[PDB]
Amino acid sequence: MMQYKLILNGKTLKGETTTEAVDAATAEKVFKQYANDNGVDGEWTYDDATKTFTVTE
């Protein structure tokens, strides 16, 4: 699976985003900026079936 996704699981407001990044490293860098802007860059969950990162504040 390629097309990674992000889910902001904020204790205030939630959100999501997609990307064209094909590897977890590239996607992490893309999603980091998205959450660092949303004020949620905290923890970064991991997955092996869904390939979707989530923030944990």
Curated annotation (Swiss-Prot):
Function: Binds to the constant Fc region of IgG with high affinity.
Source domain of life: Bacteria
Sequence repeat residue intervals: 4-57
Protein species of origin: Streptococcus sp. group G
Name by which UniProt lists this protein: Immunoglobulin G-binding protein G
Record localization: Secreted, Cell wall
Shown stretch of the complete protein: 229 to 282 of 448
Gene: spg
